[PDB]
């Protein structure tokens, strides 16, 4: 997250870190046994880490649970990033509490202008690299479809939305992929892609979770 703020320990209780020896992506806990992330985060050997604040320190509220299975969306295209969503099942259910909690799926798609909370452990620099270790947060509005398409001609599908600031300075970044965009207490987006980080006229692009609620629910119900 570039241009954000330190969230505060365990203030984003649905935020998970995906670890394969190291943090490589975020995710969102949507029930005691399932995490939503980005399809481009897929790999084998995933451990889901819940209750994290500093991802390099065991502070006392963590739960580390290996994945039993991953399900990439059947229509994910890794070239276009269309349908950049996957589900990860935990081998055992997390113990839910005030610091490890699921985030509701949306009932409706959120509109341009709605404020959202974007969070992650990704790079905090638009030039160069620095990783923050504690969770960073950014409040940002959803942008209109027309301004998203104008920013990224030929690249925005009906399964994507932009959020952030056309002036730049505040955005998600590498290492935030797969993490949450929460608006009005519902998971509306997944951190997906952008051209650089926090650059002018290149806002962040997010998977449009409301298009996937039926797939998520049906997949969980049978897996
Ligand atoms: N918003 C983003 N700009 C670059 C990037 C990489 C990975 C995830 C999100 C972004
Ligand atoms: Ca920790």
Swiss-Prot record:
<feature type="binding site">
    <location>
        <position position="62"/>
    </location>
    <ligand>
        <name>Ca(2+)</name>
    </ligand>
</feature>
<feature type="active site" description="Charge relay system">
    <location>
        <position position="84"/>
    </location>
</feature>
<dbReference type="InterPro" id="IPR050127">
    <property type="entry name" value="Serine_Proteases_S1"/>
</dbReference>
<feature type="active site" description="Charge relay system">
    <location>
        <position position="177"/>
    </location>
</feature>
<feature type="disulfide bond">
    <location>
        <begin position="109"/>
        <end position="210"/>
    </location>
</feature>
<feature type="disulfide bond">
    <location>
        <begin position="7"/>
        <end position="137"/>
    </location>
</feature>
<feature type="disulfide bond">
    <location>
        <begin position="25"/>
        <end position="41"/>
    </location>
</feature>
<feature type="domain" description="Peptidase S1">
    <location>
        <begin position="1"/>
        <end position="221"/>
    </location>
</feature>
<dbReference type="InterPro" id="IPR018114">
    <property type="entry name" value="TRYPSIN_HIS"/>
</dbReference>
<dbReference type="GO" id="GO:0097655">
    <property type="term" value="F:serpin family protein binding"/>
</dbReference>
<dbReference type="GO" id="GO:0004175">
    <property type="term" value="F:endopeptidase activity"/>
</dbReference>
<feature type="binding site">
    <location>
        <position position="52"/>
    </location>
    <ligand>
        <name>Ca(2+)</name>
    </ligand>
</feature>
<dbReference type="GO" id="GO:0006508">
    <property type="term" value="P:proteolysis"/>
</dbReference>
<dbReference type="GO" id="GO:0007586">
    <property type="term" value="P:digestion"/>
</dbReference>
<comment type="subunit">
    <text>Interacts with SERPINA1.</text>
</comment>
<keyword id="KW-0964">Secreted</keyword>
<keyword id="KW-0378">Hydrolase</keyword>
<feature type="disulfide bond">
    <location>
        <begin position="148"/>
        <end position="162"/>
    </location>
</feature>
<dbReference type="GO" id="GO:0097180">
    <property type="term" value="C:serine protease inhibitor complex"/>
</dbReference>
<dbReference type="InterPro" id="IPR033116">
    <property type="entry name" value="TRYPSIN_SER"/>
</dbReference>
<keyword id="KW-0222">Digestion</keyword>
<dbReference type="InterPro" id="IPR001254">
    <property type="entry name" value="Trypsin_dom"/>
</dbReference>
<feature type="binding site">
    <location>
        <begin position="174"/>
        <end position="175"/>
    </location>
    <ligand>
        <name>substrate</name>
    </ligand>
</feature>
<feature type="binding site">
    <location>
        <position position="54"/>
    </location>
    <ligand>
        <name>Ca(2+)</name>
    </ligand>
</feature>
<keyword id="KW-0720">Serine protease</keyword>
<keyword id="KW-0479">Metal-binding</keyword>
<feature type="binding site">
    <location>
        <begin position="171"/>
        <end position="172"/>
    </location>
    <ligand>
        <name>substrate</name>
    </ligand>
</feature>
<feature type="disulfide bond">
    <location>
        <begin position="116"/>
        <end position="183"/>
    </location>
</feature>
<dbReference type="InterPro" id="IPR009003">
    <property type="entry name" value="Peptidase_S1_PA"/>
</dbReference>
<feature type="disulfide bond">
    <location>
        <begin position="173"/>
        <end position="197"/>
    </location>
</feature>
<dbReference type="GO" id="GO:0005615">
    <property type="term" value="C:extracellular space"/>
</dbReference>
<dbReference type="InterPro" id="IPR043504">
    <property type="entry name" value="Peptidase_S1_PA_chymotrypsin"/>
</dbReference>
<feature type="binding site">
    <location>
        <position position="177"/>
    </location>
    <ligand>
        <name>substrate</name>
    </ligand>
</feature>
<keyword id="KW-0865">Zymogen</keyword>
<dbReference type="GO" id="GO:0004252">
    <property type="term" value="F:serine-type endopeptidase activity"/>
</dbReference>
<keyword id="KW-0645">Protease</keyword>
<protein>
    <recommendedName>
        <fullName>Serine protease 1</fullName>
        <ecNumber>3.4.21.4</ecNumber>
    </recommendedName>
</protein>
<keyword id="KW-0732">Signal</keyword>
<keyword id="KW-1015">Disulfide bond</keyword>
<dbReference type="Pfam" id="PF00089">
    <property type="entry name" value="Trypsin"/>
</dbReference>
<comment type="similarity">
    <text>Belongs to the peptidase S1 family.</text>
</comment>
<keyword id="KW-0106">Calcium</keyword>
């Amino acid at each position: 997250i570039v241009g954000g703020y330190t969230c505060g320990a365990n203030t984003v209780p649905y935020q998970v870190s995906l670890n394969s020896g190291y943090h490589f992506c975020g995710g969102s806990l949507i029930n005691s046994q399932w995490v939503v992330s980005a399809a481009h985060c897929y790999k084998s050997g995933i451990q889901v880490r819940l209750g994290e604040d500093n991802i390099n320190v065991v502070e006392g509220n963590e739960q580390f649970i290996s994945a039993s299975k991953s399900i990439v969306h059947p229509s994910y295209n890794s070239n276009t990033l269309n349908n950049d969503i996957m589900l990860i099942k935990l081998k055992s259910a997390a113990s839910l509490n005030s610091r490890v909690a699921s985030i509701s799926l949306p009932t409706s798609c959120a509109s341009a202008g709605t404020q959202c909370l974007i969070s992650g452990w990704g790079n905090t620099k638009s030039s160069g690299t620095s990783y923050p270790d504690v969770l960073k947060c950014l409040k940002a509005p959803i942008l209109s479809d027309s301004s998203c398409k104008s920013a990224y001609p030929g690249q925005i599908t009906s399964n994507m939305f932009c959020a952030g600031y056309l002036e730049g300075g505040k955005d998600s970044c590498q290492g935030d992929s797969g993490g949450p965009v929460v608006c009005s207490g519902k998971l509306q987006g997944i951190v997906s892609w952008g051209s650089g980080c926090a650059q002018k006229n290149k806002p962040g692009v997010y998977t449009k979770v409301c298009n996937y609620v039926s797939w998520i629910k049906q997949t969980i119900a049978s897996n």
